[PDB]
Design a protein around this ligand. Structure first.
Ligand SMILES: *[C@@H]1O[C@H](CO)[C@@H](O[C@@H]2O[C@H](CO)[C@@H](O)[C@H](O)[C@H]2NC(C)=O)[C@H](O)[C@H]1NC(C)=O
Ligand SMILES: *[C@@H]1O[C@H](CO)[C@@H](O[C@@H]2O[C@H](CO)[C@@H](O)[C@H](O)[C@H]2NC(C)=O)[C@H](O)[C@H]1NC(C)=O
Ligand SMILES: *[C@@H]1O[C@H](CO)[C@@H](O[C@@H]2O[C@H](CO)[C@@H](O)[C@H](O)[C@H]2NC(C)=O)[C@H](O)[C@H]1NC(C)=O
Ligand SMILES: *[C@@H]1O[C@H](CO)[C@@H](O[C@@H]2O[C@H](CO)[C@@H](O)[C@H](O)[C@H]2NC(C)=O)[C@H](O)[C@H]1NC(C)=O
Ligand SMILES: *[C@@H]1O[C@H](CO)[C@@H](O[C@@H]2O[C@H](CO)[C@@H](O)[C@H](O)[C@H]2NC(C)=O)[C@H](O)[C@H]1NC(C)=O
Ligand SMILES: *[C@@H]1O[C@H](CO)[C@@H](O[C@@H]2O[C@H](CO)[C@@H](O)[C@H](O)[C@H]2NC(C)=O)[C@H](O)[C@H]1NC(C)=O
Ligand SMILES: *[C@@H]1O[C@H](CO)[C@@H](O[C@@H]2O[C@H](CO)[C@@H](O)[C@H](O)[C@H]2NC(C)=O)[C@H](O)[C@H]1NC(C)=O
Ligand SMILES: *[C@@H]1O[C@H](CO)[C@@H](O[C@@H]2O[C@H](CO)[C@@H](O)[C@H](O)[C@H]2NC(C)=O)[C@H](O)[C@H]1NC(C)=O
Ligand SMILES: *[C@@H]1O[C@H](CO)[C@@H](O[C@@H]2O[C@H](CO)[C@@H](O)[C@H](O)[C@H]2NC(C)=O)[C@H](O)[C@H]1NC(C)=O
Ligand SMILES: *[C@@H]1O[C@H](CO)[C@@H](O)[C@H](O)[C@H]1NC(C)=O
Ligand SMILES: *[C@@H]1O[C@H](CO)[C@@H](O)[C@H](O)[C@H]1NC(C)=O
Lengths: 162, 420, 198
């Protein structure tokens, strides 16, 4: 097997040789020479995602490694993973490119910020105050809805054999 | 043999009616899932793992796991869009006034609690407490909106629907005192405002008692949140089944790639590996299709939840039973893990009473019809009263309208009509 | 980027067909992916097995495409049912459902056709230029409480009027736009004012 051998707090019985998890995979082992219990963890693994602002605008990119601590590889640490190539900003804006756990990045260089929920607006409420409109505004909005997709038919014999 | 329900027979007769003389403010809950866990699968790790020659054998098979990655990314972005549509419906974060006095109504249970470090109302905290690793390329992506932002949207919607009625959902937010908003809501369902203004204390007490009973009932029944628990259960058990399928023989001589490689020469090792990888690809295809179907169902549920949020909350809905049993008044949303919980406040009549009714009153050869109510009679006199409440009033010429002579309608009765 | 949905439909179908076509050039683990080559290079005893593997792979791929098409068709049918509902309600009438036919109060809508879809033009009414006022629930007058029939009592500071909820149209409080119900002892917040009688 392959992994990271670490000290195990698990206590095998004297006849116990292997340890297994719920997934029925090896996780704890007993050393034949010196009778000690060791853990096995798979080597740090994760997917790679590329944040790009569009090739038309520029070419700079910031890469996010999913589910890895930043110490196991302009570096930022998020809940989604380790984010490199982008700088974290205390400011807040709307979400431009989603990342995860409330973090969104955009191009201004590349900046990563916590997404903004909306404009704060406290309304003055009191038990003897009402507000009545004095004017109006006719608004026109659009709404696009797909209806039918393209009808296709296959010829099995010619596709399979020909 | 199951019994459909208790026998009942309303004493229908030719000229009798029943009119409520009392009401009962009722609060009901409705639980709706919104999104499930966003998962992404890895092709090479799941199919065999760390064998480079295995990857060489796989890459010539086709671009199947490319399609699988595409489909799972589509599902994930669909989940995020579902949450956005359900919750992100207001572009401002409304904030409740510091002094929380709304004419006797007590919103402590649903308003955010600053004492808690999580900034959540007791109801949603109970919901969170009432709902309950090792991966081989099986990644779980985090949702874009954390729980705190969802609670923030819920608080904003609550503040908007308490301070400014339903006006904030159709333009700028216009403040209005809460008792007048409630009187407006009764006037929406055909009951005049005086009924509220003469019963404000009783209505407030009933509302508080109902909301307390709802909190207690959620605290007691553990099976109420099944519609949310089963989503997590389904996802977890499907993932566990997929993991278990990894160590399946699939007709090969052994279930271990390394053992097959070591103990067998390439001639038949190739055939064994082909069988194994085909079986694993088939299992992964089945899992992906199951995930797609579940995503479609959850998206339908999320669209229904968005419609409920838009109609029952942001306004008042006259659709029957769409926002709770009884006449709808207003509803309060509450956040929940992978879903949303509504608190429908509804008006329910009670304590009906028999009366003798007539279609019209003949007087001076003229037939007087009720303008907004219904003619009743306690036995001797005749009054006109609103349909949903017993509010007897002396019949006059301003709450009735004349139409034709009194020899054409059927069942007309003789009486006088006072003129002010 | 306004027409994202229809473009997504077209692109999804095009890329699905493209992937299905490109699936032909896959060996599926067979020594070749051409019928004639396997027919000419090998005799039936193992060419049969090779052809079996190839045809099984191709059928599996095509069936996967069919299932994907079925799921997408179900989604499109749901969207089309929603579109039919929107037409029948917002276009052929007026809707009291909030945000169903556009943000704000709905007035009327116009349809427009589009490739593989339909586009609506929701004409909606939006209030603006709000102004605060001091209001009372009811008016006590000679021991009788007067409630508005449809408006709400407002006051600029010295005089009281009744006006409709959605627009500021002040009116003199008379006995025809108010209805009496009981005395002014039980209503909480009632104020004092005269009620003109024509
Ligand atoms: C209500 O709003 C409309 C526009 O929203 C106002 O009409 C504008 O009035 C100004 C001042 O006379 C003109 O310069 C503009 O050209 C008008 N706009 C249009 C489109 O004609 C209207 O005056 C407002 N009414 C009140 C009472 O405030
Ligand atoms: C008052 O209404 C009740 C029902 O709301 C009537 O009770 C039923 O009346 C019918 C006809 O008189 C009887 O056949 C039923 O047996 C009655 N129900 C029961 C449970 O006994 C009642 O009769 C009405 N009374 C008046 C004076 O109208
Ligand atoms: C209308 O119904 C309400 C609630 O059912 C009644 O209020 C109750 O009245 C009784 C008798 O005075 C009290 O013992 C209860 O404590 C009251 N309940 C509450 C919640 O306050 C009310 O009396 C009924 N009115 C009529 C005319 O029947
Ligand atoms: C609104 O509801 C809250 C919660 O039920 C009430 O707070 C309770 O107050 C009583 C008496 O002061 C205490 O015995 C309870 O322990 C309180 N509840 C909790 C959860 O601590 C509150 O009094 C109600 N009314 C107002 C105006 O807030
Ligand atoms: C039906 O209601 C009317 C009006 O409430 C009653 O008429 C009055 O009833 C009160 C209470 O009994 C008496 O003090 C008045 O003298 C009655 N007025 C007249 C002109 O008679 C009537 O009694 C009620 N009928 C029944 C059968 O209850
Ligand atoms: C209501 O009153 C009218 C007039 O007072 C009644 O009409 C009379 O009915 C009697 C009985 O058949 C006739 O002899 C008269 O010729 C009728 N006069 C007119 C002008 O129509 C009527 O019958 C009464 N109906 C009820 C239900 O009391
Ligand atoms: C009507 O009056 C109220 C208070 O008299 C206004 O509420 C305040 O408005 C100012 C305007 O910028 C804000 O700075 C305050 O913060 C508001 N008060 C509170 C407690 O938040 C209200 O804005 C007025 N209405 C209009 C349309 O201007
Ligand atoms: C509130 O509105 C009333 C109605 O217009 C105002 O009363 C009039 O005010 C104008 C201008 O001040 C005078 O020319 C009229 O003579 C007033 N009419 C009456 C019957 O008094 C009143 O002034 C307004 N209040 C405020 C504070 O502006
Ligand atoms: C509205 O008018 C009534 C009667 O004109 C006022 O009632 C009087 O209130 C004073 C002050 O408490 C008492 O001394 C009188 O005995 C009351 N008379 C009656 C007939 O009720 C009432 O106060 C007025 N409203 C306000 C807000 O002042
Ligand atoms: C109105 O609210 C104020 C504080 O906002 C409170 O002191 C007062 O008692 C309330 N009065 C009524 C009639 O609600
Ligand atoms: C009213 O209905 C009863 C049956 O409940 C019937 O016997 C009677 O004839 C009806 N009266 C008229 C005027 O039709």
């Amino acid at each position: 097997g392959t992994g990271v051998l670490t000290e195990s707090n698990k206590k095998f019985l004297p006849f116990q040789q292997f340890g297994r998890d719920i997934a029925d995979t090896t996780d704890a082992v007993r050393d034949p020479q010196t009778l000690e219990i060791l853990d096995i963890t798979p080597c740090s693994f994760g997917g790679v995602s590329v944040i790009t602002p569009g090739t038309n605008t520029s070419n700079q990119v910031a890469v996010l490694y999913q589910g890895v601590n930043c110490t196991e590889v302009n570096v930022f640490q998020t809940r989604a993973g380790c984010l490199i190539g982008a700088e974290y900003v205390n400011n807040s804006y709307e979400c431009d490119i989603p990342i995860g756990a409330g973090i969104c990045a955009s191009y201004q260089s590349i900046i990563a910020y916590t997404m903004s929920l909306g404009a704060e607006n406290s309304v003055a409420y009191s038990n003897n105050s009402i507000a009545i409109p004095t004017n109006f505004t006719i608004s026109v909005t659009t709404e696009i809805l797909p209806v039918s997709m393209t009808k296709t038919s296959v010829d099995c014999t010619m596709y399979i054999c020909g | 043999t199951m019994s459909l329900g208790a026998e009942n027979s309303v004493a229908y007769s030719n000229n009798s009616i029943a009119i409520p003389t009392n009401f009962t403010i009722s609060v009901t809950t409705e639980i709706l899932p919104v999104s499930m866990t966003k998962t992404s699968v890895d092709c090479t790790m799941y199919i065999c793992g760390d064998s480079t020659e295995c990857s060489n054998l796989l890459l010539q098979y086709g671009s199947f796991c490319t399609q699988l990655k595409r489909a799972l990314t589509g599902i994930a972005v669909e989940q995020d869009k579902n949450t956005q549509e359900v919750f992100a419906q207001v572009k401002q974060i409304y904030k409740t006034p510091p002094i929380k006095y709304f004419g006797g109504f007590n919103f402590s249970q649903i308003l955010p609690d600053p004492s808690k470090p999580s900034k959540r109302s007791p109801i949603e905290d109970l919901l969170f407490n009432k709902v309950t690793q090792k991966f081989k390329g099986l990644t779980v992506l985090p949702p874009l909106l954390t729980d705190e932002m969802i609670a923030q949207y819920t608080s904003a919607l609550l503040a908007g629907t308490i301070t400014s009625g339903w006006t904030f959902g159709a333009g700028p937010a216009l403040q209005i005192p809460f008792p007048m908003q409630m009187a407006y809501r009764f006037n929406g369902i055909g009951v005049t405002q005086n009924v509220l203004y003469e019963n404000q204390k009783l209505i407030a007490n009933q509302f508080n008692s109902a909301i307390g009973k709802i909190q207690d009932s959620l605290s007691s029944t553990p099976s109420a949140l099944g519609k949310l628990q089963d989503v997590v259960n389904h996802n977890a058990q499907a993932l566990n089944t997929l993991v278990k399928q990894l160590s399946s023989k699939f007709g090969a001589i052994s279930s271990v790639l390394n053992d097959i490689f070591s103990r067998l020469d390439p001639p038949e090792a190739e055939v064994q590996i082909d069988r194994l990888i085909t079986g694993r690809l088939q299992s992964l295809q089945t899992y992906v299709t199951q995930q797609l179907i579940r995503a479609a169902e959850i998206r339908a549920s999320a669209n229904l939840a968005a419609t409920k949020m838009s109609e029952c909350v942001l306004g008042q809905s006259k659709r029957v039973d769409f926002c709770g049993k009884g006449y709808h008044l207003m509803s309060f949303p509450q956040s929940a893990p992978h879903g949303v919980v509504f608190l429908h406040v509804t008006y329910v009549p009670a304590q009906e009473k028999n009366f003798t009714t007539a279609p019209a009153i003949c007087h001076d050869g003229k037939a007087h019809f009720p303008r907004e109510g219904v003619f009743v009679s306690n036995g001797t006199h005749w009054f006109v009263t609103q349909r949903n409440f017993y509010e007897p009033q002396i019949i006059t010429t301003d709450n009735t309208f004349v139409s034709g002579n009194c020899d054409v309608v059927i069942g007309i009765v003789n009486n006088t009509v006072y003129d002010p």
